[PDB]
Symmetry: C3
Subunit: 153 residues, 3 copies
């Protein structure tokens, strides 16, 4: 029936004396992500993908003072539903030279799935290095990409 | 039903002495995007996403720069011809989403007009077209304001 | 019915001493992609989009094999999870060499490996307008999107 797709992008700088929080998971590391919120690059990209699929604009059009990125993802889900859409699936990729994200991925999926009220099998998170190329390759920031499918019920 | 997705990417350098044209909107700015056409990075990304969804190749296959008419070509006219070819191949467009990444200028006040242009060229209602804007958080050539990037996604149905 | 989308990304450094293999096609060139196996940046991105659509994690969690064998095993896993592939679209970003003449060859390799009609597979090419490590010819990037349906 009335399916729509959305895509999302984010990047934040890695800076000293900040926690690294990705997909709502705190990952031990000497740097963390810089942003007005908690700088959760993965959650921001997915949020942008969901708004894009519902044609609701973007994260900066909607947004909460001191709200963490999970609260913002939950509010995104609310606004998507308000517009008449159900979320069908989310897929994503984190690009980080370091640290190793592998043992944290299923926790990020579980977080996203709880926040969006989706079963686990409709949420995916992937990881890639940047083969030491560019600012990502030098560990100067972390990027996330996201894709979402929604349907107007 | 026979749904298909497409994705697109574009980037152009930002240089003095060119109009800044994104999503068909001329934006007051002291630099513009460099290309053989009007260099409309957002429209090119969306055009690639539509050709891609329809499995019709890419924008360079359809609109060759070896043609003089490509010089300063209106990227909305290219987008409309793309949509016509996608329709001719048997596909209806269901939605478009996109992202522009630019350090500057401020895009927010032009976004709704970009969306209106795309919706007009694709013969869609506004509510099936979306345009998002991002900085690159000061990282890389984008953070240095050397170019502007666009990303796009499209869903069509045969 | 029960459609799902996936997206994929990959990048490899481009250097002398290795052949250039993209979309299973060997392309004549002074340099080639550095990676564990054949460094096939396009097949890797597409494999990731397929696993992503099926919510099966990623290429590194699943896997001498060449990237086409990996793509085939990926399709089989996607199939076993209950999904049929509807279509694939992709973009290679390479400042050089010229990729247009090899596009049908890549599409044909990908289509064969996924058991898809040729008209459900698309590959596009872009330069990076001389910006960044891609624009300087230091690497090649690929991006992929896949649509599947749970049958
Ligand atoms: N060059 C740019 C980049 C971003 N933006 C707007 O700022 C908010 C934060 O990304 C987003 O809402 C975005 O639309 C902008 O107006 N111009
Ligand atoms: N490495 C590349 C890059 C680009 N191209 C083709 O040239 C057009 C404009 O860059 C693109 O749209 C594409 O058709 C190519 O054949 N190989
Ligand atoms: N910073 C990173 C980057 C990637 N990965 C994991 O490594 C494997 C190959 O990319 C993939 O399986 C991916 O999930 C990781 O654990 N941490
Ligand atoms: O024939 C061409 C050449 C370049 C094109 N392009 C480069 C960047 N954006 C569009 C498109 C079509
Ligand atoms: Cl920036
Ligand atoms: K990028
Ligand atoms: Zn962010
Ligand atoms: Zn362009
Ligand atoms: Zn790879």
């Amino acid at each position: 029936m009335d399916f729509r797709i959305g895509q999302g992008y984010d990047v934040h700088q890695l800076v000293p004396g900040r926690p690294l929080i990705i997909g709502g998971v705190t990952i031990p590391y000497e740097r963390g992500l810089l942003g007005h919120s908690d700088a959760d690059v993965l959650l921001h990209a997915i949020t942008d993908a969901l708004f894009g699929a519902a044609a609701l604009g973007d994260i900066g059009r909607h947004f909460f003072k001191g709200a963490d990125s999970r609260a913002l993802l939950r509010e995104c889900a609310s606004r998507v539903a308000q517009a008449g859409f159900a979320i069908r699936n989310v897929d994503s990729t984190i690009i980080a030279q370091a640290p190793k994200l592998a043992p944290h991925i299923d926790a990020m999926r579980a977080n996203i799935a709880a926040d969006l009220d989706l079963p686990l099998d409709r949420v995916n998170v992937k990881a890639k290095t940047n083969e030491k190329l560019g600012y990502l390759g030098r560990g100067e920031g972390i990027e996330a990409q996201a894709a979402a499918l929604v349907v107007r019920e």
